[PDB]
Amino acid sequence: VDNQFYSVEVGDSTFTVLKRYQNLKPIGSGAQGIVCAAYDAVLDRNVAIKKLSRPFQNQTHAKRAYRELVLMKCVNHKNIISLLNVFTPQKTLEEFQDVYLVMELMDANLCQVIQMELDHERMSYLLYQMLCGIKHLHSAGIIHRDLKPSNIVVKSDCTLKILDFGLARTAGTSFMMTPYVVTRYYRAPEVILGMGYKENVDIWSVGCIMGEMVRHKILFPGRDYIDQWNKVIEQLGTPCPEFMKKLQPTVRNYVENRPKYAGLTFPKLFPDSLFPADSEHNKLKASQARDLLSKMLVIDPAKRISVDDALQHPYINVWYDPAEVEAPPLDEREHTIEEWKELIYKEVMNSE
Ligand SMILES: CSc1nc(-c2ccc(F)cc2)c(-c2ccnc(Nc3ccc4c(c3)CCc3cc(NC(=O)CCCN(C)C)ccc3/N=N\4)c2)n1C
């Protein structure tokens, strides 16, 4: 029963895990949960273990935790999180407290990668894999809308996985008591301005990541959506009247009433100084990288490149492989914390 489990203090937290998981060491502790590295003695491989403490404790944690468990079963792709295991040490719904998630151990997140100079081979391979993952989600009917470096992980061999499935179709009120601050620098204008969106909402986030890889700074920092919008228009320019007409008349009022900005060309935004461009190879790849940035970092989604088109772009297309690109492949729920506990328990136990 519970002799299948042991308890060890990993930093501040107590981890109670199956005895197959050995030599726990803390990686991360924050909003989602606490993560540790372990050796899995049954599979003879290194794994990451994420602890969710009482994920049913409010409707935000609860909706996220449930969505993640369910959506895992709708995705089969090497660039998206796969679970090796999920378990709870508690034996009844009454006692049920914690869910543990187990997956392949990765070496770093894309935050650490951004702090490094990458050659064009590594940058384009990372972007290629991000797009493969996003296409897989899109073909499953999942539009992410919150892709960001901290939820993307890599191995030393430059292989990449996306860890999370983004925002609810309808989220509504996401209030929580915490110092845990959500990072929104990578969210599309559609998201920021509460517009309609389609698949290429996620192309804006890839743009913000690719731009950050090149600049080694956040493109669009800011305390809040106001700051963020200002940083967007200062660099890309005020968007055309055409785009304003698609805004709610009240956001439209705010946006159309900001100071106008001409906006900078992509050469200015991403000068030659930032690029590997010594050899003829690297000069050409430098212009192709800028060309792709200029098509992804477009405010109007009707003018922004699609996933399928980004995969056909010469900067990316050198990696193109039908098997990875054309690999074949809930949100409307509002519950009390009592009902969520049950829904999550049934999914962990696999009761239904
Ligand atoms: C969104 S947060 C998250 N959730 C999961 C997850 C895990 C299991 C699941 F089933 C599902 C999800 C993961 C995950 C999944 C698979 N592998 C990993 N690996 C891993 C290995 C190294 C590493 C990181 C992550 C993240 C960053 C990291 C954190 C730390 N902690 C420190 O405090 C470092 C230095 C502190 N110093 C300033 C004093 C030290 C090394 C660090 N550098 N790189 C992490 N992540 C990070």
Side-chain angles (χ1 to χ4, degrees), residues 1-72 74-179 181-352:
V1 185
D2 271 320
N3 83 346
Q4 278 172 341
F5 299 87
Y6 73 104
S7 276
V8 63
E9 209 99 344
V10 305
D12 200 346
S13 153
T14 288
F15 266 61
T16 303
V17 299
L18 289 165
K19 287 180 167 163
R20 65 187 287 170
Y21 302 121
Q22 308 181 353
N23 196 33
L24 271 49
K25 293 161 181 291
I27 288 160
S29 54
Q32 307 292 297
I34 168 156
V35 180
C36 76
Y39 175 66
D40 178 353
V42 176
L43 285 172
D44 182 39
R45 68 190 281 195
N46 299 326
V47 301
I49 307 171
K50 184 176 184 196
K51 187 198 198 190
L52 310 185
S53 318
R54 304 194 59 91
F56 49 80
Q57 71 187 252
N58 66 66
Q59 287 170 46
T60 309
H61 282 140
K63 201 170 293 196
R64 189 144 193 111
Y66 185 63
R67 178 173 156 92
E68 157 174 47
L69 279 175
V70 157
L71 281 187
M72 224 86 77
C74 306
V75 307
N76 190 39
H77 200 280
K78 65 170 133 174
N79 294 132
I80 306 303
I81 177 167
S82 280
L83 294 204
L84 300 174
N85 213 351
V86 50
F87 68 81
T88 174
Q90 294 95 33
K91 193 47 163 240
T92 66
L93 174 76
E94 284 54 56
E95 292 161 277
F96 175 50
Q97 294 229 55
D98 308 319
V99 178
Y100 293 75
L101 306 174
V102 188
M103 75 179 276
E104 159 158 37
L105 186 57
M106 311 289 277
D107 297 323
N109 69 14
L110 206 51
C111 275
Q112 302 165 269
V113 167
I114 274 151
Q115 281 175 276
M116 325 182 311
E117 303 194 357
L118 300 159
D119 67 7
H120 285 295
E121 166 169 62
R122 292 203 186 114
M123 197 176 315
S124 64
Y125 186 53
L126 287 176
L127 293 171
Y128 168 69
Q129 280 173 100
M130 285 180 234
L131 287 166
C132 286
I134 293 160
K135 191 189 172 62
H136 195 65
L137 293 186
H138 287 172
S139 75
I142 300 160
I143 302 182
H144 195 296
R145 283 193 294 160
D146 202 28
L147 220 53
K148 64 186 96 183
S150 72
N151 297 329
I152 302 168
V153 285
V154 302
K155 283 170 85 183
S156 294
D157 70 355
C158 210
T159 59
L160 175 148
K161 298 174 189 298
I162 305 164
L163 291 182
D164 84 314
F165 303 89
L167 306 183
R169 187 177 172 175
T170 47
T173 282
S174 296
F175 174 68
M176 278 180 298
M177 298 254 180
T178 187
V181 172
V182 176
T183 77
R184 43 216 180 254
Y185 310 138
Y186 309 90
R187 292 187 177 170
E190 299 94 291
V191 177
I192 290 165
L193 295 172
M195 302 164 75
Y197 63 84
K198 68 188 161 150
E199 277 82 6
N200 74 348
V201 68
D202 288 323
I203 282 293
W204 173 274
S205 306
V206 176
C208 294
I209 295 164
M210 181 178 183
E212 203 182 321
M213 281 167 169
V214 170
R215 203 182 273 187
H216 304 297
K217 321 160 155 188
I218 302 152
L219 296 207
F220 305 124
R223 299 170 289 175
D224 58 38
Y225 282 160
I226 295 288
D227 268 21
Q228 217 177 305
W229 179 246
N230 287 337
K231 295 280 202 148
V232 168
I233 61 181
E234 286 166 15
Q235 293 180 64
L236 294 184
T238 313
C240 294
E242 336 180 353
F243 163 84
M244 307 304 205
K245 294 177 176 175
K246 301 213 266 181
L247 299 181
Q248 286 146 331
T250 169
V251 181
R252 189 180 200 221
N253 195 295
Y254 177 70
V255 159
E256 265 169 278
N257 261 286
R258 309 293 319 126
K260 304 292 190 308
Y261 282 102
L264 282 43
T265 68
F266 276 86
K268 309 262 204 219
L269 281 167
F270 305 100
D272 293 319
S273 40
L274 295 173
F275 279 99
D278 180 341
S279 63
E280 291 281 13
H281 173 267
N282 277 341
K283 285 173 171 177
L284 178 57
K285 290 274 144 228
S287 52
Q288 286 174 0
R290 259 214 301 272
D291 183 80
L292 184 54
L293 268 168
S294 70
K295 291 180 170 142
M296 289 197 302
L297 285 171
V298 179
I299 297 175
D300 194 341
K303 291 198 269 220
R304 191 189 306 147
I305 191 162
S306 69
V307 174
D308 281 351
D309 281 343
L311 278 168
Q312 286 312 286
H313 192 278
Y315 195 63
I316 302 300
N317 186 248
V318 300
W319 305 107
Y320 191 99
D321 173 10
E324 309 169 315
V325 164
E326 301 145 15
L330 164 58
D331 283 326
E332 292 87 44
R333 307 185 62 104
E334 297 157 353
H335 287 97
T336 72
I337 51 180
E338 294 98 317
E339 287 159 351
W340 276 125
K341 194 186 192 188
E342 231 163 42
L343 283 177
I344 294 182
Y345 189 65
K346 262 84 165 297
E347 197 52 47
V348 172
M349 290 330 286
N350 218 69
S351 279
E352 310 191 344

